Amino acid sequence: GELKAIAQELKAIAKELKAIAWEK
């Protein structure tokens, strides 16, 4: 449910932070 959708958002953010690390 809701908490699963939030967990998916966190995993998407985790990928963004790793992309920022490796350039910006």
Q: Does 9 bind ligand NH4 (CB under 6 A)?
A: yes
Pull the structure tokens for residue 7. Answer: 């967990």
Least Å distance, CB 5 to its own copies, is 9
Under the binding rule (CB under 6 A), the answer on residue 20 touching ligand NH4 is no
Cα angle: 18, vertex 21, 10; to 5 degrees? 30
7 belongs to the binding site for ligand NH4 (CB under 6 A): no
Tell me which H or E stretch contains 12.
helix 2-22
Q: Which residues bind ligand NH4 (CB under 6 A)?
A: 6, 9, 12-13, 16
